[PDB]
Structure formats: C-alpha cells, structure tokens
C-alpha cells in the first residue's frame, strides 16, 4: 500500500509534461480521491486537483489550474497529471495522495531556459575517528544525490542542503564520521539531469 | 456526487 | 476559499505546549472538513488530525485539534525535538460554491532543547580545485544549540563577500543543528594569502580553526 510519482524533469518555458502516479499493493478499482499537490522550493502546499476512482469519477481542479492541466485514471494502478504552457511559476515538487492520508515521496519539475551542467566532485579532508567529505559544486539544476559506499554507509552521514552560488550554479557538501574499519570510503554522486554519476574515494 | 474532498478513511 | 494560518512561526521549549490557529473565509464543508499535517524537510506531509479533531491512526494523543465552521486550533502537548517541523491546516469546501480545497500557509515550529556547544572542522581545498580558477574552502559546525555565527578571516582580515551558509534540520533526538559554511575566492586571491580561519561563535564563547595554504 504505497505510491510513487515519476516523470519530473527540466523543461523549457511554454512546454508540456505528464506525471504518473503508480500504486503498489492495491488497485484503483476501489473508492478513493486521488489528488495532486505541489510545493515550490521553500514554500507551502498548493492543491492542484483530484480524480475520484471506483464507483464515481469526478475530475475537479483549483481555479488557477482549471483548463490548463488534466488528471485521469489511465489504468487500475496509474493516475496521471498532464501540464501545458509551463512557466517558472510551475517549478515545484509534485505529490500525489490517496485521501490526503497516503502520500508518495514526490517528483520534481524545473521550468527554465537554462541548460544543464554536471557537477565537479572534490574530496574533503582534514589538514581516533575522522570526518571526511565530498564537496559537490557548479551543477544545474537540482537535484543531486550522494551516498557512501553505494548505500553501505548510513550512520554518521550529514548531507547539507544545496545552496545556489553567486555564479548561478548549485553546490552542497556531505560529511561522514568514520573510524578505521570501514576504511577508505567512497562517495557516490548522481546527477540525473545530466545522466552522470561520479564516485570519489577519500582517506586520512 | 462529489460534494468536497475526502480526507482520511471513507 | 482562503485558509489563514497564524503564526507563520514560533519557537518553544521542550516540555511545553504550543498552539497554532486557522481561520477560514467561508465555512468548511459540513462545518468540520478540516485537517492537520506535519512535514519535515524532504518528506511528504503526514496526516495527524481530520474532521477537525479525530486522530489519524498511529498518531499520538498529545496532538489535539478543535474548532468549527471558520475557526480552528491545533495544540501539541509536551513538545519534543521530533516535533520540529512545519505544520499545515487543510480546508475542504463545497465544490458547487467555489473551489474544493485550500491549504493554510504553514507554521514553522522550532523546539528549544538543552544547550550544546559546537565542534568545528575546516577543510582546505582539494588539489584539482585551484587549476579551475575558482577555489572553495569548507567549514563545518557540528551538533550545537542554539544558533551560532560564522566569520571568515583571511590573514587577520574579515571577509564580506563569497561566503555561503547552510544548516541541517533539527535533530529529532536532542534538537541540535549542523552547519556548513563556505568561502569562495578566485585563484588569484587564494594564492595571494597564507592564513585562513573560520570563527564559529555561540554567545560569548567561540571555537576557531585555521589552516595555512602552503601547510596543506
Ligand atoms: Ca473544476
Ligand atoms: Ca504571523
Ligand atoms: Ca491550496
């Protein structure tokens, strides 16, 4: 009994885009209100609209969204959201929810005339335990994910929120507190919007 | 027959 | 339909009770279609209360809401660090007279726990940095409370430009922060000074880490 959103990406202004909401462990043959909600970076929840499933089938929308977006049940485990005439005002993470009770983790949308750029990773190292890290810089747009030893290292991990540098590009840092074993560690930096993935191995 | 939004169990 | 939530934020200690208020331009559907959410950074919202005052399942009783029609309140009893988050009310309306729903604007809640002092680490530039033209130095402040202040010093002088700060959310167990500060300089300026220091102060007490360019 869960939900996942996919289909987010970087799009030019005035473009069009369809997000899909996938259900696991149950199907849309029963009675739910399946709704989408978006949240621009650092802002509040905004309701976009709903589609009923099961025994009734109402599509309903926010005044701003009405006529420009559509929501529909495309199978018994997929609900889509379709957007058109996209502008900067539409940049956000998009959640789909069941009865506003069960929620997905969210898919992200950047609308801008800017072009992507992969990150440069540099190791962070002091001049019986040690704090080493990875500085990721000059990437665009968001997001980027860092892991240590491909998901092996989890405790002692502090990944900071990115900050847009004065250059107009983003940057962040991740640190981990590690003793002797394990043992010379590797940071895994994946940047979806450029299809790259950089690993960086650091040590005392 | 949609009068509002459903929040929580049915 | 406009849901007005106040305050926009509030700081409150551990062990306290805290109150958030929601006021609606029209009666919510059936006088009670009203709900309360908690959301921490990077997570989706979580249902705490629906029908104005029903606890959603698995949600602790110290969360309590009440109200009717256009006026509603949310109270958290016996606050703890895990509560630090942003809270929203959600209004559900008569689809025939206007829009079906409106989210309140959110309240940011900050929890005040035991004061803990920071440790600070400094990281001098990786070798492949300086060949790029721009250099970044990273300073990290760990596991502290309350908020600290950061000054960058280049050879005794104080920096005013090229600094950037970033904070982790509050620890859910002891309310503590974590900060990364970064100073950015063009390759000329970096290769034109020796000493580089990061001053993290918390009140009257400071911690100072420094390095020298050549020494690294
Ligand atoms: Ca409508
Ligand atoms: Ca206020
Ligand atoms: Ca809204």
Coil/strand/helix, residue C189: helix
Residue C139's H or E segment, with its range, is strand C134-144
Could you tell me the resolution of this structure in angstroms?
Answer: 2.5
Closest residue by Cα to residue A138 from C134, C189, C187: C134
Is beta strand C101-103 parallel, antiparallel or unpaired with respect to C46-50? unpaired
The CA distance from A79 to A100, in Å, is 15
**Given CA atoms C86, C87, C91, C92 in this order, what sign does their dihedral have?**
positive
Evaluate whether C209 touches C199 at the Cβ level (below 8 Å): no
What is the dihedral angle through the alpha carbons of C47, C53, C59, C63, rounded to the nearest 10 degrees?
A: 110
Give Cα separations from C9 to A167, C19, C21, C82, C84 (angstroms). 31, 11, 11, 17, 11
Cβ of residue A35 closer than 8 Å to a chain B Cβ: yes
Compute CA A128 distance to the chain's CA centroid, rounded to the nearest angstrom.
37
- Provide the CATH number for the domain around residue C49: 2.60.40.10
Say whether both C85 and C33 belong to one domain.
Answer: yes
* Structural domain of A200: 114-204
H or E element: which one contains C212?
strand C205-212
CA-closest candidate to residue A122, choices A137, A107, A138: A137
Tokens 């006088």, residue located:
C31
Residue C88: its chain A contacts at CB < 8 A? 44-45
Find chain A residues with C-beta within 8 A of B8's C-beta.
99-101
For chain A, report the end-to-end CA distance as a whole number of angstroms. Answer: 45
Cα Dmax for chain C = 72
C8 and C85 together in one domain: yes
Given an 8 Å threshold on Cβ–Cβ distance, is B6 in contact with A58?
no
The angle subtended at Cα C199 by Cα C195 and Cα C204, nearest 5°, is: 140
How far apart (Å, rounded) are the C-alpha atoms in residues C62 and C74? 11
- Say yes or no: A129 and A84 in one domain: no
Domain edge (last residue) among C60, C84, C113 = C113
Structural domains of chain A, count: 2
Residues C145 and C74 in one domain: no
Task: For residues A173 and A107, state if they share a domain.
Answer: no
Subunit contact A161:C41, Cβ cutoff 8 A: yes
SS3 label, residue A15 = coil
Which among C95, C130, B7 is positioned nearest to A32, based on CA atoms? B7
Look at residue A156 and give its three-state secondary structure.
Answer: coil
A33 Cβ under 8 Å from any chain B Cβ: yes
Enumerate neighbours of A (3 or more CB pairs within 8 A).
Answer: B, C
C-alpha to C-alpha distance for C135 and C186, rounded to whole angstroms:
6
Paired tokens of C183: 């100073």
CA distances from C179 to A165, C149, C168, C174 (A): 16, 10, 6, 16
**Which residues share a beta bridge with A171?**
A137, A163
Best residue in B2, B3, B8, B9 for a mutation probing chain A (most A CBs within 10 Å): B2
Residues C97, C42, single domain; the answer is yes
Does residue C122 sit in the same domain as residue C185?
yes
- DSSP letter for C187, please: H
- Say if residue C35 is in the same domain as residue C46: yes
Q: Among residues 1-10 of chain B, which lie with CB inside 8 Å of chain C?
A: 2-5, 7-8
Experimentally determined by: X-ray
């Amino acid at each position: 009994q869960s939900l996942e959103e996919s289909g987010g990406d970087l799009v030019q202004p005035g473009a069009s885009l369809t997000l899909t909401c996938k259900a696991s462990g149950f199907s849309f043959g029963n009675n739910y209100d399946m709704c989408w909600v978006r949240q621009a970076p650092g802002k509040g929840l905004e309701w976009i609209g709903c589609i009923e499933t099961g025994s009734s089938d109402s599509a309903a929308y926010a005044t701003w969204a009405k006529g420009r977006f559509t929501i529909s049940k495309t199978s018994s485990t997929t609900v889509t959201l379709q957007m058109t005439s996209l502008t900067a005002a539409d940049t956000a993470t998009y959640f789909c929810a069941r009865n506003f009770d069960l929620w997905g983790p969210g898919t992200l949308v950047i609308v801008s005339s800017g072009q992507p750029k992969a990150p440069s990773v540099f190791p962070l190292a002091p001049c019986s335990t040690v704090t080493l890290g990875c500085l990721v810089k000059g990437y665009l747009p968001e997001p980027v994910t860092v892991t240590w030893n491909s998901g092996t290292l989890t405790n002692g991990v502090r990944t900071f929120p990115s900050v847009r540098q004065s250059s107009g590009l983003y940057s962040l840092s991740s640190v981990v507190s590690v003793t002797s074993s394990s043992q010379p560690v590797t940071c895994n930096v994946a940047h979806p919007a450029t299809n790259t993935k950089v690993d960086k191995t650091v040590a005392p | 027959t949609r009068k509002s939004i459903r929040i929580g169990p049915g | 339909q406009v849901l007005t939530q106040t305050p926009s934020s509030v700081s409150t200690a551990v062990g306290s009770a805290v109150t958030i208020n929601c006021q609606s331009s029209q009666n919510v559907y059936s006088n009670n279609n009203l709900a309360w959410f908690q959301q921490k950074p990077g997570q989706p919202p979580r249902l705490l209360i629906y029908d104005a005052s029903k606890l959603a399942s698995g949600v602790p009783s110290r969360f309590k809401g009440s109200g009717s029609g256009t006026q509603f309140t949310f109270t958290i009893s016996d606050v703890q660090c895990d509560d630090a988050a942003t809270f929203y009310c959600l209004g559900g309306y008569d689809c025939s007279s206007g829009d079906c729903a409106a989210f309140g604007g959110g309240t940011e809640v900050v929890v005040r726990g035991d004061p803990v002092a920071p440790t600070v680490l400094i990281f001098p530039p990786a070798a492949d940095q300086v060949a790029t033209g721009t250099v970044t130095i990273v300073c990290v402040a760990n596991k502290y409370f309350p908020d600290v202040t950061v000054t960058w010093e280049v050879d005794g002088t104080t920096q005013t430009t090229g600094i950037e700060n970033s904070k982790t959310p509050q620890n859910s167990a002891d309310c503590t922060y974590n900060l990364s500060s970064t100073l950015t300089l063009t390759s000329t300026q970096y290769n034109s000074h020796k000493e580089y220091t990061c001053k993290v102060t918390q009140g009257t007490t400071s911690v100072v880490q420094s390095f020298n360019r050549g020494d690294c």
